[PDB]
Structures are given as C-alpha cells and as structure tokens.
Amino acid sequence: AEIKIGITMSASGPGAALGQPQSKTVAALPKEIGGEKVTYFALDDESDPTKAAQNARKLLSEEKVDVLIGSSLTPVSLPLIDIAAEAKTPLMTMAAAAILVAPMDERRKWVYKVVPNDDIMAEAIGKYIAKTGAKKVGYIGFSDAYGEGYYKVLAAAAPKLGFELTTHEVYARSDASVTGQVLKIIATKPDAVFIASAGTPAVLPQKALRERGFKGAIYQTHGVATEEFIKLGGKDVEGAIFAGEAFSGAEDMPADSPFRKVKARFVDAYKAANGGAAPTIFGVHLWDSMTLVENAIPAALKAAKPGTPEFRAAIRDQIEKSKDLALNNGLSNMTPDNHNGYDERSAFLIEIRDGAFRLKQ
Numbered sequence: 036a037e038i039k040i041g042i043t044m045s046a047s048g049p050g051a052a053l054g055q056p057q058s059k060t061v062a063a064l065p066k067e068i069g070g071e072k073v074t075y076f077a078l079d080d081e082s083d084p085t086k087a088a089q090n091a092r093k094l095l096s097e098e099k100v101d102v103l104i105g106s107s108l109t110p111v112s113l114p115l116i117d118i119a120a121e122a123k124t125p126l127m128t129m130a131a132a133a134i135l136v137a138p139m140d141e142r143r144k145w146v147y148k149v150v151p152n153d154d155i156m157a158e159a160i161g162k163y164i165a166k167t168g169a170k171k172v173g174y175i176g177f178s179d180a181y182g183e184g185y186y187k188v189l190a191a192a193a194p195k196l197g198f199e200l201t202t203h204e205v206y207a208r209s210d211a212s213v214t215g216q217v218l219k220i221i222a223t224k225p226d227a228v229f230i231a232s233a234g235t236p237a238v239l240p241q242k243a244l245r246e247r248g249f250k251g252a253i254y255q256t257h258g259v260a261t262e263e264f265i266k267l268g269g270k271d272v273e274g275a276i277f278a279g280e281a282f283s284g285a286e287d288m289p290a291d292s293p294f295r296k297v298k299a300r301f302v303d304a305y306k307a308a309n310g311g312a313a314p315t316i317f318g319v320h321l322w323d324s325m326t327l328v329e330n331a332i333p334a335a336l337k338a339a340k341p342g343t344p345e346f347r348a349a350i351r352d353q354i355e356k357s358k359d360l361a362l363n364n365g366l367s368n369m370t371p372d373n374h375n376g377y378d379e380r381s382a383f384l385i386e387i388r389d390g391a392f393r394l395k396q
C-alpha cells in the first residue's frame with residue numbers, strides 16, 4: 036500500500052505555540068516520495084502525555100504507520116519512546132530534551148531527533164553568560180524533564196565557568212502566577228536570571244521579573260523562538276538571549292548560506308499551503324523530520340514494501356546513516372550512538388532586538 040506517516044503534536048494546551056505551527060505544516064508535506072504515494076495522519080495530543088500515547092497506539096495499531104512523528108514537548112514525547120520501540124517503528128520526536136535520544140539504548144535505537152539536544156544549548160548559553168562577567172545567576176524553569184535538563188547542565192557547568200546559580204525555582208506550564216518564585220530570585224540579588232521554558236508560558240516569568248524591578252540580563256531557551264513570544268512579551272522580552280537554531284539567525288548570514296536555502300524551501304511551501312502566512316520555527320521541526328524520512332525512503336523501498344516491519348526497519352537503518360546534512364535545525368551527522376546529530380557548531384546565540392530574532396554572534 037501507500038506510505039503512511041503518523042503525527043501527534045501539541046496543537047492545544049500549553050504547547051500550542053509549538054504544535055499549531057506543526058499542524059499547519061502538514062499540508063505542505065509531499066504527497067509522493069520515491070515514486071510512492073504518501074498519506075499523513077495527524078492528531079492533536081493537547082500537550083498531554085496520556086493522549087499522545089493513545090494517539091501513537093492508534094496510529095501504530097490501527098493505521099500501521101511506517102513512521103511516527105511527535106510529540107511537540109518533552110514530557111509528552113517521553114512515553115512514545117517505548118511505544119515506538121515495541122512497535123519497531125521509527126519515531127521522529129519534535130521535542131528538545133537530550134534524554135529523548137541520549138544516551139543511546141535499545142529503545143532509543145528507534146528514535147531520531149532534529150531539534151538539537153538541550154545539553155548542547157545549555158553549555159553554549161552558559162559559556163556566553165560567563166563571558167559577560169555575570170557571577171550570580173538566578174534560575175526558574177518548568178518542573179519537568181525539559182526544565183530540569185537545563186538546570187542540571189547549567190548547575191554542573193557553573194563552577195567550571197565561574198558563576199553560581201542562586202536558586203532552583205520551578206513552575207508548571209499552565210500556572211497563573213510565578214510571583215513567589217520571582218520574589219525569591221530577586222531577593223538573591225543576581226546579576227542575571229535564566230529561564231528554562233517554552234511556548235507562550237515563557238512570557239510570564241520574564242514579565243514578572245521586569246514588573247518586580249529586575250533590570251539585569253534575562254536568558255531564555257530555544258523554546259521561545261516563536262514570534263508569538265515576541266508579540267505577547269513586547270518590551271519586557273526585548274534583549275532576551277538564548278542558544279538556538281540556524282533558522283532563527285538565518286537573516287544575519289551570507290546569501291549562499293545553506294541555512295538560508297533550507298529555510299526558504301520550508302517558508303515557501305508553508306506559505307503556499309497556508310494562504311501566504313509565514314511560519315514560526317516550530318513547524319520546521321516537522322519539516323526537517325520529513326527531510327530525514329524522505330531521504331531514507333528510496334533505499335527503504337528497495338528493501339521492502341510499505342506497511343511491513345521490514346520497510347520500517349529499513350527506514351530506521353537508513354536514517355542512522357545520514358551525514359553532512361544541512362537542516363534548519365543545524366548541521367546533522369547521524370551515527371549509531373547519536374540520533375540527534377549535532378555538536379556545538381549548531382548552537383547559535385540569538386537575541387530579541389527591535390521585536391525580531393537576530394543572530395547575536
């Protein structure tokens with residue numbers, strides 16, 4: 036039969052600013068790959084791990100999809116690892132935490148990940164923060180594996196880089212207030228504050244810090260790299276800096292940059308499918324995942340027919356061989372033990388300047 040791709044995304048819930056762009060990207064994906072028809076099955080998981088697991092089981096057991104893609108967020112994606120592995124179906128996760136694919140194990144052998152691992156980003160932003168002369172850095176982040184991935188790496192790096200983390204405050208994504216946490220951070224009198232958050236929930240702690248009088252540097256993560264964050268945040272997020280993807284800095288690169296080229300492809304296709312509307316970065320996590328899948332399909336078709344475990348296993352084998360590939364997410368080199376594919380060369384420092392994401396250095 037035709038090739039079938041299943042996708043679960045957080046199109047509603049606190050992940051909406053990530054999942055909605057992904058949902059709108061589906062219509063831009065190719066109807067034929069390697070001379071074979073392709074059908075997409077996309078489901079909203081509502082930013083809920085239980086619903087994502089239900090979606091995956093439905094796509095795997097009922098549609099027998101050849102590849103599963105999702106989810107948008109780390110906590111939502113975690114349970115999909117075991118589900119995809121048990122089904123011997125490759126999973127292209129669209130979330131960010133390193134734990135989604137590293138260290139390698141017998142289940143993560145089935146998982147690939149186009150967003151650069153957060154530990155790479157945390158090391159990069161930590162080095163930058165140190166170079167500014169900051170010695171005391173406050174911290175607030177999500178009380179989940181995404182936030183904690185930033186905290187643990189920054190906390191380990193701190194003494195080696197010459198600063199100290201003054202707090203370890205957390206919040207849940209939908210929380211109405213972080214006032215208690217922010218007051219605690221402010222009371223430590225830090226030079227700067229790090230926020231580990233994603234989507235529109237990332238605005239709250241930054242606005243709260245500014246409203247409570249904090250005037251120092253505020254650092255965020257690539258979870259904020261959507262123009263929706265700039266729009267909601269306004270003057271309060273001006274000057275935010277984070278380590279992120281080539282996509283976000285593409286306009287401040289040479290004309291022949293491969294990153295401009297791969298971005299143009301995506302933007303043009305997205306606009307054509309969405310009435311001329313421009314995408315935010317999160318849609319590109321679906322797009323780049325499909326780049327890996329599309330590249331693997333011709334060899335897989337030589338091995339087996341779609342809808343068979345052999346075809347899925349062939350896709351898994353082929354993606355692992357991907358080398359020297361410019362994605363919107365960076366320069367990707369897969370290996371048997373690294374299903375992310377990036378090193379520090381793909382960590383770009385991005386700043387919000389005059390209401391736009393800009394390549395900072």
Ligand SMILES: O=C(O)C(=O)Cc1ccccc1
Nearest residue numbers: 108109130131181233257258
């Ligand atoms: O919120 C999460 O759990 C994430 O994994 C956030 C994220 C996802 C994709 C790119 C950057 C951040």
